[PDB]
Amino acid sequence: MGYFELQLSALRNVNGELLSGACCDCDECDTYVRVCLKEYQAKVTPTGPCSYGHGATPVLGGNSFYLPPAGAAGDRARARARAGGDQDPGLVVIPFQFAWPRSFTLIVEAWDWDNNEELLIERVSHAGMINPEDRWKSLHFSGHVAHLELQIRVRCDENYYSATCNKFCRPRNDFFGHYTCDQYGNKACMDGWMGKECKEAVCKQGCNLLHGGCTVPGECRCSYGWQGRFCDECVPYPGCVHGSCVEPWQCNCETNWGGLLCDKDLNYCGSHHPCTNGGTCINAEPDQYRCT
């Protein structure tokens, strides 16, 4: 989810001494750096172990040495994607899979390699607060023996966001969604897609989505009972002749037309009539009458 970085750039012990006042023999030390990441507290500044993680460098040089800068690129794959023998000492990487508490206590030590605790060169502490910012932060110190220049930074892992590295967002384009992720870790639906999970597609423009749908963006496939390019006209009762529909399977007959399929003339005589001698016809039952 995230990792704490430490970039050592300079360490200076001109006298070549230990913190105990003794000599590294004042013919030079073999200096390596330990890093202790633990809980930040209140008043009870001394309690034991590195609960948030720990790190160590190999011997980097002698009494005093200066380390090159790195590169404002490859930052992610240099610290979190390499095989054994990570050939960059001075970069201490402490990954974490919990919610970053922001408040922390950093203890950085300088040691002498010999082959024991009486070989500590310099111990340095600093408790404070830091947020997952992609910007380094400089820390300089001047102890009784050594002088150190550090650069620390907290960083959310790729696809993890927010100031606690807990919000997750990984880009996707498959069965379960079509989207990317943004600055703040929210989903950005790819063009043609919508919805809370960028799962629902955008259909043909004009498609009545009350009765139509689409599996691929740009389609318009109607439901059962609706038809047309836009799925907006109902399918009437098959056999409907003098009728219409508003809902599917309806055969709403027209004026003076009746029966199921609207094929029965109720006003037989006011239309194609049968009367004789200018008498008088009257409508009587579908397709029937009386002409007197």
Numbering used by the authors: 27 to 51, 62, 65 to 153, 158 to 334
Reproduce, without paraphrasing, sentences from the article in which this PDB structure was first reported.
Here, we present the first structures of Jagged2 (N‐EGF2 and N‐EGF3), which has only 58% sequence identity with human Jagged1 (N‐EGF3), together with the longest known structure of a Delta‐like4 ligand (human Delta‐like4 N‐EGF3). We expressed and solved the structures of various N‐terminal fragments of both human Delta‐like4 and Jagged2. These fragments include the N‐terminal C2 lipid‐binding domain, the receptor‐binding DSL domain, and two (“N‐EGF2”) or three (“N‐EGF3”) adjacent EGF domains. Two crystal forms of Jagged2 (N‐EGF2) (green) and one crystal form of Jagged2 (N‐EGF3) (dark green) were solved, including a total of seven crystallographically independent copies of N‐EGF2, and 1 copy of N‐EGF3 (N.b. not all of EGF3 is visible in the electron density). All of these copies have been superposed on each other by alignment of the DSL domain, showing some flexibility in the hinge region between the C2 and DSL domains, and further flexibility in the hinge regions between the EGF domains. However, the angle between adjacent domains can vary subtly, resulting in the ligand structures appearing to fall into two groups, one group including Jagged1, Delta‐like1 and some structures of Jagged2, and the other including Delta‐like4, and some structures of Jagged2. The observation that Jagged2 is split across the two groups suggests that there is some flexibility between adjacent domains of the Notch ligands and that all may be able to adopt these different conformations. The Jagged1 and Jagged2 C2 domains bind calcium ions (shown in red), whereas Delta‐like4 and Delta‐like1 do not; the aspartates involved in calcium binding are not conserved in Delta‐like4 and Delta‐like1. Both Jagged1 and Jagged2 contain N‐glycosylation sites in the loop between strands 5 and 6.
